[PDB]
Design a protein around this nucleic acid. Structure first.
Ligand code: MG
Ligand code: ZN
Lengths: 184, 151, 155, 87, 81, 129
RNA sequence: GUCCGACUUUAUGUCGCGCACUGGUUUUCAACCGGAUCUUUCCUUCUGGCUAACCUGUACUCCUUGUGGGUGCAGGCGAACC
């Protein structure tokens, strides 16, 4: 049942993940009866330093909240199946271009479709189980931008090792180096 | 600290939290929030009353946080929006109350002064709403249609 | 506009030097001549299908457009077949390196093909003189309503 | 101070306040240059060796001078945990 | 003074200051899960409740209007959450 | 009411610099302050500074090194020609060996020398040196 | 490369500012403006042109075997231009 949960099936890696998903459908009582109707949008790979890798599943985002309901169970099962791989559940959002003055009008690009907002939602979804409590931006002596994220000290244990995963994956999405924070 | 009509410089207000999303401990459903909002509106309570009651009685912090949209917009989409925005209507109610007091007892002059202040505020707000076009462009507030809108 | 039966006053308004033959065995409406004014401006459909005469219509009459093109806002409509357009602009006074709000009022002549309300913004064109003060014809009402598009609100 | 051929034409490049990098004026009869004695292993003050500091008149006037020096006494490791960079 | 870390105020100093003047404008209030002495149900109340909050179960008004927090009704039990 | 947040930012900077402080809390923190401070910092009057999210208008806290002497804003952002640049440089900057008039350009926020080498000029914002 | 001076009636070498004019600049370099580009990132975009251009690939290689370069026309490269 791999075929109809990707909407198109190149990049055989997804198939294994889909097979993984199939192998986790079979846990019927708690991880099914809703888990079937969750289409994908071309899960991708990210190189991770230290020998690991990060696989980013791209939800079409009509019902992202369903993922964010199942997420802890599904992510832990996927981690168990794939050794030395860190799975993340990213929303994919359609970025729209700038309303450049010379380009013809395209009916009011909504702010939810804009670079800053989409990257913010990317960061929010990158670490789901723990919520972001604050945001900081720094610029070193040279003049390059770095961003710091005040995570909740409570509940952090749903990560406990995935900080480099988030760092590297978001770097490869945009390129801006990031460091995360743990408060007292 | 502005306080157009009094040199008072206070800053009494509320600082809503940083978390745009809902609190993690909330168990109510956003939809059920919507139906209770609409039913209280049917009872007639203004969206400020709606917000204060939902904050006092239930885990409703900000209906914008929970339902993803704001109370007046919920009412407008559901077709329960009042013809006159609540703040304006309260201004008319206060102005007509002061007018009745003034006509009742003539010599009170600070009453007249506060009435002038209130009429200034109400003209100002009506101008704003006409620019945003919530009100009809011919909507005018003087004395008698004022009393009719009091009803 | 000319407002309900252009054939109104003591003389006949025939579109000059155009003849519709009664002898014709078709009984067609009329030979309603027109022309494309140029400058990449589209003549409105009501200019072709319309029933007015308006010798001063740049689209159906005898007047011709050339020269300056202005973009203003309609401020006065009360006079017949003609419009008064406000033009607000800035004037650089150099002694203070500052700018000065100024406004002029240019009359113009609107063809019946155009509907104009107070507050509209209008692309107007210079023409052969029409009257003592009129030297322009309206060519394009850009904002027919603009913000008056919607008139109600029923979700 | 650098000419064309590359020579020093300014006369006595003056110091800056170690507490606020402000210069020390010629007749700034409020600044003070502290010399802190170096300490060897066994607790003898080595003569001729020292850490130098310069506090400008302005910082002394505001009364913050001691505070600033505490900072330095921490940053150069001449003194232990007196000052809190976060307060 | 003259050198701080405005990024990292002391938490004691942080709550020491007034809200609207902290690093992030945070609210002082909170939400209490209060149970009436009669009914064991749990009713949520905003700490500085304005209206006379009533349990929908029974007419057992739990918190009375006040300038600050609403005053409880001497029999209820509150839980911080 | 507050009118030009950049003026308030630079006024806080000058006040806290003159007193000899090292950090400044800029309250309103709009785009123009951020660009202004990156220009500043790449020139070196400022060290490693910081932005803060607030869900509303954010905030800035900026580290100093005492390197600065005075900043300031020309609040009515005057239209400057490519020629009139020398006029402002003479009337504001201490000496052309240094100093920087900061103006917004078709390229963006930019000090006067960058403007002259890019051969562009726009509206003037402030002056730092 | 050209060669300027101590060097003086005049030439070579030596030694001089470390080149008085012509030159590569992936020896790094540094700027200092650019331009095209890929990033869920359009530059009015079409409607035909004209195809300027080869993804064409067709008859096939003219060339040491090697796409260095050619006689060459149906889909189809459009800013190189109308
Ligand atoms: Mg502004
Ligand atoms: Zn009870």
């Amino acid at each position: 049942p791999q075929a109809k949960i990707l909407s198109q099936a190149p990049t055989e890696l997804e198939l294994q993940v889909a097979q993984a998903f199939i192998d986790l459908e079979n846990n019927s009582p708690e991880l099914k009866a809703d888990l079937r109707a969750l289409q994908f949008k071309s899960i991708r790979e990210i190189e991770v330093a230290g020998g690991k890798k990060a696989l980013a599943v791209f939800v079409p985002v009509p019902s992202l909240a369903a993922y964010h309901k199942v997420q802890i169970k599904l992510t832990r099962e996927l981690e168990k199946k794939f050794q030395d791989r860190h799975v993340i559940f990213l929303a994919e959002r359609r970025i729209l271009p700038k309303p450049s003055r010379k380009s013809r009008q395209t009916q009011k690009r909504p702010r939810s479709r804009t670079l800053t907002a989409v990257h913010d939602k990317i960061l929010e979804d990158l670490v789901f189980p723990t919520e972001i409590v604050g945001k900081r931006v720094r610029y070193l002596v040279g003049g390059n931008k770095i961003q710091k994220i005040l995570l909740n000290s409570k509940d952090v244990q749903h990560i406990d090792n995935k900080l480099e995963s988030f760092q590297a994956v978001y770097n490869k999405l945009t390129g801006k180096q990031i460091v995360f924070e743990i408060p007292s | 600290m502005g306080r157009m009509h009094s040199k008072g410089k206070g800053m009494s207000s509320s600082a809503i939290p940083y978390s745009r999303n809902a609190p993690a401990w909330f168990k109510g459903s956003s939809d059920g929030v919507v139906e209770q909002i609409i039913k209280y509106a049917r009872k007639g309570l203004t969206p400020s009353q709606i917000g204060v009651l939902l904050r006092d009685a239930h885990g409703v912090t900000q209906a914008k946080v929970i339902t993803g949209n704001k109370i007046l917009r919920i009412l407008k989409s559901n077709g329960l929006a009042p013809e006159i925005p609540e703040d304006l209507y309260f201004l008319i109610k206060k102005a007509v109350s002061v007018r009745k007091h003034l006509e009742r007892n003539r010599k009170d002059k600070d009453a007249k002064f506060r009435l002038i202040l209130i009429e200034s505020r109400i003209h100002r707000l009506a101008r704003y709403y006409r620019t945003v076009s919530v009100l009809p462009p011919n909507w005018k507030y003087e004395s008698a249609t004022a009393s009719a809108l009091v009803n | 506009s000319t407002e309900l039966t252009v054939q109104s006053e003591r003389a006949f308004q025939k579109q000059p030097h155009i003849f519709t033959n009664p002898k014709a065995k078709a009984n067609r409406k009329t030979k309603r001549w027109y022309k494309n004014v140029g400058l990449g401006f589209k003549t409105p459909k009501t200019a072709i299908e319309g029933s007015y005469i308006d010798k001063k219509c740049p689209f159906t009459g005898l007047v011709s457009i050339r020269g300056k093109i202005l973009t203003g806002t309609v401020v006065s409509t009360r006079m017949h077949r003609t419009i008064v357009i406000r033009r607000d602009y800035l004037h650089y006074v150099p002694k203070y390196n500052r700018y000065e709000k100024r406004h002029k009022n240019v009359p113009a002549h609107v063809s019946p093909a155009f509907r104009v309300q107070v507050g509209d913004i209008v692309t107007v064109g210079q023409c052969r003189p029409i009257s003592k003060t009129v030297r322009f014809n309206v060519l394009k009402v850009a904002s027919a309503t603009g913000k008056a598009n919607k008139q109600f609100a029923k979700f | 101070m650098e000419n064309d051929k590359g020579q020093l034409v300014e006369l006595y490049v003056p110091r800056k306040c170690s507490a606020t990098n402000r210069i020390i004026k010629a007749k700034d009869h409020s600044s003070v240059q502290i010399n802190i004695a170096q300490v060897d292993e066994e607790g003898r003050a080595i003569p001729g060796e020292y850490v130098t500091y310069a506090l400008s008149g302005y910082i002394r006037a505001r009364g913050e001078a001691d505070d600033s020096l505490n900072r330095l006494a921490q940053q150069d490791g001449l003194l232990k945990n007196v000052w809190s960079y976060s307060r | 003074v003259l050198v701080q870390d405005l990024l990292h105020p002391t938490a004691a100093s942080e709550a020491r200051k007034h809200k609207l003047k902290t690093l992030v404008q945070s609210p002082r209030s909170h939400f209490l899960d209060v149970k009436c002495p009669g009914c064991l149900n749990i009713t949520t109340v905003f700490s500085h409740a304005q209206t006379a909050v009533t349990c929908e179960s029974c007419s057992t008004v739990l918190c009375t209007p006040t300038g600050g927090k609403a005053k409880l009704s001497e029999g209820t039990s509150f839980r911080r959450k | 009411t507050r009118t030009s947040v950049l003026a308030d930012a630079l006024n806080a900077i000058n006040n806290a610099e003159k007193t000899g402080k090292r950090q400044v809390l800029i309250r309103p923190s709009s785009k123009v302050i951020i660009k202004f401070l990156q220009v500043m910092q790449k020139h070196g009057y400022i060290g490693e500074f910081e932005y803060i999210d607030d869900h509303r208008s954010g905030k800035i806290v900026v580290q100093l090194n005492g390197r600065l002497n005075k900043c300031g804003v020309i609040s009515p952002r005057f239209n400057v020609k490519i020629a009139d640049v020398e006029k402002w440089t003479a009337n504001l900057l201490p000496a052309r060996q240094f100093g920087y008039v900061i103006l917004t350009t078709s390229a963006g926020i930019m000090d006067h020398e960058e403007a002259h080498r890019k051969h562009v000029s726009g509206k003037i914002l402030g002056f730092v040196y």
